[PDB]
Design a protein around this ligand. Structure first.
Ligand code: CWD
Ligand code: CWD
Ligand code: ZN
Ligand code: ZN
Ligand code: ZN
Ligand code: ZN
Lengths: 258, 258
């Protein structure tokens, strides 16, 4: 009966509330996806439990074991009924789980420390002084691994071989590396995250250039789940009624510190 | 056997070729959706025939008879197997037909004659010297009919009762109205169309302000069509390989005349 929702701690989508140790169950968390889950649940008429994905991963299939990890894995192996998270709709995932129409649009983007002489991916690919990398697992790293586009292939060829690693375990790690590297590390990350961090103190980062690609986040369910239809219709209704635009403003810009 | 594709003449998605009269079948047409249809068919392995929707409409349900018209109607009543067009994914349509994930993002936007003293929807709403309207049927009109947002509800109240009608039968008529009205008509239209027209001679229009909403176009099939799965996967593959971005550049900006 109670729907198990898998999600991931990624600001400002899902965050621990300041007083979380005093709170129980779903009340421990806040953020864009916490708000969205409550609306999806109200509109589809189900009770739910938010659970943070155990391995802290979005979802990839291991080439060796062929096992899926992360939120995708939780759906594929029946540990969760729905994923409500900044989970990128991709072909390889759509083969194993179902996605709603997108609730947010985004693209891969460049984050620099202010004053870094970089305006584009082409700029990054033509030089070697400034290192650059991505989140170590996820759709951004896979975009680069798989790209046949010359500039992105060049960038991947550099990143896959760079030592020490240019890849990071978490967005927070990537942002800290930008901030601490004196302009010598740029971070490739999803544009929505880039925009959020740009509005956070110490206000020393910025998004530069256009997005490298265009894609979306969707709500995911196990392939063939009965919940999928209602969830998809709910996403469409909430977009049409302006809920999604309101939530982005609430969590990105209303609180902006810059 | 051969898949019947319904589409609509709307630039630069589907246009007749300059020499279209010396050509037959699918060869009469060119454009973003013509190229897209070719790629979808190649990846899904079907042969197809492009047909222009008989009533020239996108699709809406008659409130009295409950009959669907336009491309949506062609799918609903089994006259076509798939619609490959700038067809907006909406809740009411998703209830009666299936949509792929979106192949293009867009939002409602404002087109003005250059020099018109308007920067936003709010500006249009606060004045009466400059008239404004939308395509007389389709998702844009419906956005205003249904909007609870104050500025948009205000705009709708004006538009529904304006005389003579501020509504137009085709985009071409809307653009012509802007161009001939000496700044006294502004046109509300999908951002993709607005961006295309801004780059065509006589180069006398521009898009102003941000988009009023965010949505997507999707490839549509009849509810429960087997074709639906393959087509959806095909759209995701085409996006991931950069083909959709290549097509947008080809049809909007490579050709730019301004
Ligand atoms: N959304 C991605 C995960 N993800 C997240 C961020 Cl913030 C990023 O910059 N890159 C990613 O791959 C996915 O679903 O794999
Ligand atoms: N895409 C829409 C139709 N459509 C098209 C244009 Cl160009 C517009 O400005 N407004 C619309 O409603 C639909 O699917 O109804
Ligand atoms: Zn804590
Ligand atoms: Zn609600
Ligand atoms: Zn002719
Ligand atoms: Zn292809």
């Amino acid at each position: 009966k109670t729907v198990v929702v898998t999600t991931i701690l990624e600001s400002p989508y899902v965050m621990m509330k300041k007083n979380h140790e005093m709170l129980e169950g779903n009340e421990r968390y806040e953020g864009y996806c916490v708000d969205l889950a409550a609306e999806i649940a109200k509109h589809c008429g189900f009770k739910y439990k938010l659970t943070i994905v155990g391995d802290g991963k979005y979802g990839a299939r291991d080439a060796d074991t062929k096992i899926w990890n992360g939120m995708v894995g939780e759906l594929v192996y029946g540990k969760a009924d729905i994923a409500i998270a900044p989970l990128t709709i991709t072909l390889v995932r759509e083969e194993v789980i179902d996605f709603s129409k997108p609730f947010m649009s985004l693209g891969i983007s460049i984050m620099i420390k202010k004053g870094t002489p970089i305006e584009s991916a082409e700029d990054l690919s033509k030089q070697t002084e400034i290192a650059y990398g991505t989140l170590d697992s996820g759709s951004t790293k896979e975009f680069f691994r798989r790209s046949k586009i010359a500039v992105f292939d060049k960038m991947w060829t550099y990143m896959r071989s760079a030592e020490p690693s240019v890849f990071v375990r978490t967005t927070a790690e990537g942002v800290a590396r930008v901030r601490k590297s004196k302009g010598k590390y740029a971070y490739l990350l999803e544009s929505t995250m880039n925009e959020y961090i740009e509005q956070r103190k110490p206000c020393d980062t910025m998004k530069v250039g256009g997005n490298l690609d265009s894609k979306g986040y969707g709500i995911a369910t196990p392939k063939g789940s009965s919940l999928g239809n209602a969830v998809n219709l709910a996403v469409l209704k909430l977009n049409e009624q302006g809920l999604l635009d309101k939530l982005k403003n609430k969590w990105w810009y209303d609180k902006g510190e810059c």
